Design an enzyme around this catalytic site. Structure first.
Site, short mmCIF file in Angstrom:
data_model
loop_
_atom_site.label_atom_id
_atom_site.label_comp_id
_atom_site.label_asym_id
_atom_site.label_seq_id
_atom_site.Cartn_x
_atom_site.Cartn_y
_atom_site.Cartn_z
N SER A 137 1.75 0.14 -6.46
CA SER A 137 1.71 0.99 -5.24
C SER A 137 2.46 2.06 -5.07
CB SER A 137 1.96 -0.09 -3.76
OG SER A 137 0.77 -1.09 -3.67
N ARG A 148 -8.14 3.51 6.53
CA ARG A 148 -9.47 3.86 6.76
C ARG A 148 -10.02 3.75 5.45
NH1 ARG A 148 -7.21 8.59 8.63
NH2 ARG A 148 -5.50 7.42 7.91
N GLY A 197 -1.08 10.05 9.89
CA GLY A 197 -2.62 9.86 10.25
C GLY A 197 -2.73 8.04 9.97
N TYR A 239 1.97 5.68 -6.03
CA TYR A 239 0.99 6.62 -5.26
C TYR A 239 2.02 7.19 -4.21
CZ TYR A 239 -2.93 4.19 -7.01
OH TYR A 239 -3.95 3.66 -7.87
N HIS A 274 0.86 -1.25 -0.06
CA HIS A 274 0.03 -0.12 0.13
C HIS A 274 0.86 1.29 0.02
CE1 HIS A 274 -3.61 2.42 0.50
NE2 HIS A 274 -2.91 3.12 1.22
N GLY A 275 0.83 1.95 -1.17
CA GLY A 275 1.55 3.31 -1.28
C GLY A 275 0.80 4.48 -1.14
N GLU A 309 -5.48 -5.91 -8.15
CA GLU A 309 -5.72 -5.08 -7.04
C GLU A 309 -6.69 -5.71 -6.04
OE1 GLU A 309 -7.72 -1.38 -8.04
OE2 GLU A 309 -6.32 -0.97 -9.50
C1 EZ2 Z 1 -9.39 4.73 -3.65
C2 EZ2 Z 1 -8.61 4.41 -2.50
N1 EZ2 Z 1 -7.26 5.11 -2.77
C3 EZ2 Z 1 -5.89 4.86 -2.02
O1 EZ2 Z 1 -5.88 4.18 -1.12
C4 EZ2 Z 1 -4.79 5.65 -2.57
C5 EZ2 Z 1 -3.56 4.91 -2.43
C6 EZ2 Z 1 -3.42 3.81 -3.09
N2 EZ2 Z 1 -2.32 2.78 -2.59
C7 EZ2 Z 1 -2.10 1.64 -3.22
O2 EZ2 Z 1 -1.19 1.09 -2.88
C8 EZ2 Z 1 -3.00 1.21 -4.15
C9 EZ2 Z 1 -2.91 -0.36 -4.95
C10 EZ2 Z 1 -4.15 -0.45 -5.71
C11 EZ2 Z 1 -4.94 0.12 -6.03
C12 EZ2 Z 1 -5.01 1.62 -5.46
C13 EZ2 Z 1 -4.23 1.89 -4.43
N3 EZ2 Z 1 -4.10 3.04 -3.80
C14 EZ2 Z 1 -9.02 5.40 -1.40
C15 EZ2 Z 1 -9.32 4.47 -0.06
C16 EZ2 Z 1 -9.74 5.37 0.89
C17 EZ2 Z 1 -9.89 6.48 1.01
N4 EZ2 Z 1 -10.20 7.55 2.07
C18 EZ2 Z 1 -10.80 8.54 2.06
C19 EZ2 Z 1 -10.76 9.21 3.23
N5 EZ2 Z 1 -10.47 8.11 4.18
C20 EZ2 Z 1 -9.92 7.25 3.20
C21 EZ2 Z 1 -9.35 7.53 -0.15
C22 EZ2 Z 1 -8.99 6.64 -1.34
#
Ligand code: EZ2
Length: 350
Positions: free
Chosen positions: A239, A213, A206, A242, A197-198, A323
């Protein structure tokens, strides 16, 4: 009193609580730092802005008129002031626009959490120790010559293959207070994997404090390709994109999490999941590339897919990489935090 934390842990603390990085992220987003300075960001403000985006999303859906939509667009910019200079404020009238503003709010939320954490509380203590403890995370440096370090570097090296190479600088073993007990009910689920998770460096205070979250209910469900869950990849290439690194700041942070996936709901295309089908505990977005499944290893009872990238048989899919998405925060147990160096260089496609 000077901190007795190892220098890599101290350097991480300074990196994730860096206030100039928070301001720089907001300037890139074109937020007006005079009308909306760091210290005036609030949770209710951001939630109110998500709701406006949900209203915009439903205005396009219900065939709203131009006046209807423009007034919603202006409410967003009154709530989150922007400074576009000469330019006109972009109209929030399409799914693309609301998806960009949703992602900006996602990141502004973690900045609010970080800045609040940093300014909350109280001396005689090293501020680096004070702010370490606010993270409520045990953070240990993994020995570079240990076998876990060798497995983690192999995972990075094998699953990377676009204009940069990745160098692991530091490996941190992390344990968020309370997370193991929260994860226990799901340790029993089958199909547990160690996944990437990047995220931006400005999100990691946070992430360590509150864990990964889910987007709140007010956020537009169409802002999230597979609905409001927690997203992971099995290949560091996906990842790492990001981490929001650049020539000026080539160092990023990335997580390794143990994810209890259970029965995967396999999709080839976007689907705005608000509830999984019965019998499914996670979603797998099928990519055209997958780590070689004959090279999987098991690190402490968890599958680690560090096989080199091979083609999957999957056709007519919109994803290059797999994913994995879970819709319950308790399905994640964060295990490692990596500080990665991005060594930018071009190389032509063979
Ligand atoms: C959509 C989802 N987007 C991300 O988590 C971005 C980083 C990311 N890292 C990965 O390694 C990755 C690997 C594979 C696919 C996507 C990926 N996206 C999301 C989840 C939660 C919220 N959100 C808002 C407020 N609280 C939580 C925002 C965005």
């Amino acid at each position: 009193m000077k901190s007795k934390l190892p220098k890599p842990v101290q350097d991480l603390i300074k990196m994730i609580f860096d206030v100039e990085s928070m301001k720089k992220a907001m300037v890139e987003y074109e937020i007006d730092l005079q009308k909306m300075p760091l210290g005036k960001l609030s949770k209710r403000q951001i939630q109110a802005a998500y709701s406006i985006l949900s209203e915009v999303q439903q205005a396009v859906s219900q065939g709203s008129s131009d006046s209807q939509i423009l007034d919603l667009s202006n409410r967003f910019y009154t709530l989150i002031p922007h400074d576009f200079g000469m330019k006109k404020p972009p109209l929030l009238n399409n799914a693309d626009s609301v998806q960009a503003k949703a992602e900006m709010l996602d990141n502004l939320l973690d900045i609010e959490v970080a800045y609040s954490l940093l300014r909350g509380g109280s001396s005689s203590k090293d501020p680096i120790d004070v702010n370490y403890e606010k993270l409520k995370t045990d953070i240990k440096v993994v020995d570079r010559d240990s076998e876990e370090a060798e497995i983690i570097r192999k995972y990075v090296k094998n699953t990377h293959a676009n204009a940069y190479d990745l160098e692991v600088i530091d490996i941190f073993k992390i344990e968020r207070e309370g997370e193991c007990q929260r994860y226990k009910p799901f340790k029993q689920l089958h199909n547990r994997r160690l996944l990437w998770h990047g995220s931006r460096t400005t999100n990691f205070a946070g992430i360590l404090s509150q864990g990964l979250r889910i987007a709140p209910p007010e956020a537009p469900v169409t802002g999230y390709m597979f609905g409001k869950g927690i997203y992971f990849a099995d290949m560091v290439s996906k990842s790492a994109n990001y981490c929001h690194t650049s020539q000026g700041d080539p160092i990023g942070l990335i997580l390794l999490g143990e994810v209890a996936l259970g029965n995967m709901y396999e999709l080839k295309h976007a689907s705005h999941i608000s509830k999984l089908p019965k019998g499914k505990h996670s979603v797998k977005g099928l990519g055209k590339t997958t780590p070689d499944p004959s090279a999987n290893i098991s690190l402490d009872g968890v599958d680690v897919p560090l096989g080199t990238g091979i083609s999957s048989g999957v056709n007519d899919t919109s994803l290059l990489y797999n994913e994995y998405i879970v819709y319950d925060i308790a399905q994640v147990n964060l295990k490692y935090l990596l500080k990665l160096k991005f060594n930018f260089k071009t190389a032509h496609h063979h």
